[PDB]
Structures are given as structure tokens and as C-alpha cells.
Amino acid sequence: GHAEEYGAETL
Amino acid sequence: MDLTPKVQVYSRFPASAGTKNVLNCFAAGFHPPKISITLMKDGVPMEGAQYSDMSFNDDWTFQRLVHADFTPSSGSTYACKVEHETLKEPQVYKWDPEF
Amino acid sequence: ELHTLRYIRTAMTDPGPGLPWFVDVGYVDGELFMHYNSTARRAVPRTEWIAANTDQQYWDRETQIVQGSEQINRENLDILRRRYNQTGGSHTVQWMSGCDILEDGTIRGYHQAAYDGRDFVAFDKGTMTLTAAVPEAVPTKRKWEEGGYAEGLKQYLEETCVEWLRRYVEYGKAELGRRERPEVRVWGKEADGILTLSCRAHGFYPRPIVVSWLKDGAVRGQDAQSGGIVPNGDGTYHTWVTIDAQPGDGDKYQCRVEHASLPQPGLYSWRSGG
């Protein structure tokens, strides 16, 4: 599964 | 910045004229991801073409498989027409029937 | 053995004609098992083993997360265009994340991005920081670190990813562990037909293969070229190798195929007496 924290993709 | 597609044209199975098969065109190593890949029989686009969803490799370069069910006929030229921004004009990659 | 879990995502300004601008795809041991695109806006099964081993709440949770990923990367495209002082053009944001369960027992974790196909940032789970591969990635570093993402990401890579990978490997052990025999053809072309000889292994699974030439029963690396491993539509693989021979020397060469599906190496010649 994908990491729940999609915020960790913040650039 | 901007990498040219590396193209290979091949059949799913070793081919023989009159036997059902699948024609494949695989483009790899390119950037930007926008690409036109067209399977052709005697310069005419083939009917049941399926396109792989946009994917890339460990060096970030993009790849795409295009495939279509076909029954190869003897004397016909099968090809893959590739258009990409790195290329001056469309590049045509002829399939070797190997029969 | 060694198992890998990989999630790759691309956000593009120019996909183009009738193609989704954002795509996310999942891989277990190099095999595609999930897909998401910005047109459908739903996470979807790509193998039989993942479906019927997962319920609706699995795909609903995956859909929500990737919808979140989609929107962040939409914003990322705008942020980086402005930061690079770019006016239009074709641009891409790429992500690769996942984990490796190494033979040693040891765990590898990855969470890294590329902007326009060049390394942008990478998570260093060792030091709990985001490494800036380029000067334009320094404002990214500062925002991301202040965002406190390191803790949850270390946890995800070292534990949740690993646990998920164990689940998937179990659901697909039969398919991932299967053997598909290649059909091999040796062909030749030019001066009477024996300048360039080709050997093609059609439809093998798993991916590891050794395809080499023998001339009078001796290994020949000289004037040999490999096309690498290329995929078929059905999840099996293809590989083509060539050797440049002197015209009239076709019968001297054999193609050797070493694969898991083959108890002993296969030896093939161009037709019989070609």
C-alpha cells in the first residue's frame, strides 16, 4: 500500500 | 535534458504466416514522456492496438509498450512509427518476421 | 529470497492527446499490480492475485491516498515552474518510493523525486533528512523538514511497506514464483543470410535470463549485441541478442539460453542446416 501521508510528496 | 526513444519491434511468439500472434513495439529511455507510437501494416495503422500506462525506469526515463493481436501475412511489411520531440521526423522501425 | 515493493507516479504538463496528466502504478517483484490515473480517479487492480485478496475498503483507501498524491503533484508542477523561472514548456514531477526485503534480512527504503527527469530530492532515512540533489531543491528541503514528515516516512519504509510487501508476496507467490518456457528462434540476415545472426527468446518468466552465442561450441562475446529484456502484453518477457558473423558461417553458431524454466541450457541453431 501507498504511505498514508501524501504530504511527504510536498515540494 | 531530452532523451531519444530506444525502439524494439518484436512478436509475442516466433511467427509464421497464417498463425495468430501479437505485434509489439516498445519504446524506452525517453524524455519528455509525450510520445506517439503507431503499429502499422504496409504503412497503414493496425486496428486492435493497446497502450501501456505511463511508466519509467530507475534512471527516471520513460517507457511504453504498444501491442496488437494479428495474423502475419507473407509479403506484408509490419512496422512501428515513433514520433517524439527529440526526433526531427517520425522514425519507422520495421518488424523482422523471421520466416 | 528478495522482494521489492515499488510505487511510481508521474505528473505531466503534456501527456498528451487523450492521455491522463497524472498516473500512478504499483509493482511487486517488478510485476504491475495496481494503477491510478487522473481521468478515472480510482485505484484499480491489475493482477488476479491482488483482487479477491483485497476488499472494497482497500481500494477506497488507496483511491483517497492517490487522489491526495495527484493534487500535491498538480501544485508541485506550479511551484517548481515558478521556482525555476520557467515560462511554459513541457515539465514533469516523478516520484518513486517503496522498500526492499534483502536476502541478508536487512531492509532498504526509498522516497525520491525527479523534476524534468533529473534527481531533485531523496529521503535519507539514516540521518532523517531530505537530501537536495540540486540548488532549487533547498527550499523543498526546508519546507519538508519543517513539515515533520521524516518520522512517519521512516516508519512507513522500515515497517508498513515491509508488512504490506509480505502480504502481497503471500497473495501472489504462485504467480510470482511460476515458470514460463521461452520459444526460441535463431535467424540470420544479409550476404547469403549470414552477416547478422539473431536469437530471440519469446515469452519467458521470471525475468532473469542468460542468452549467449557459441561458435563451434565456444563462447563468443565478440561482435555480440543484446537488446536487454523487453515486455510482452501478458506479463512474460522477450529478449533479442545478435552477433555479426562472416557470410557463409551460419552453421558454426548456436544460441545458448539459460533460464529457470529450463533444467539444462537450451542450444538452438538457425533452422536445421541453415
From TrEMBL, chain C:
Any S-S bridges, and between which cysteines?
C99-C161, C199-C255
Report the family membership. Belongs to the MHC class I family.
Which GO cellular component terms, listed alphabetically, does the Swiss-Prot or TrEMBL entry include? MHC class I protein complex
Which protein is depicted?
MHC class I alpha chain 2
Q: Where in the cell is it found?
A: Membrane
* GO BP field: antigen processing and presentation of peptide antigen via MHC class I
Q: What is its main location?
A: membrane
Q: Where is the Ig-like domain?
A: 182-261
For this UniProt record, the keywords arranged alphabetically read as follows: Disulfide bond, Glycoprotein, Immunity, Membrane, MHC I, Signal, Transmembrane, Transmembrane helix
* Organism for this UniProt entry: Gallus gallus (Chicken)
Q: How does it sit in the membrane?
A: Single-pass type I membrane protein
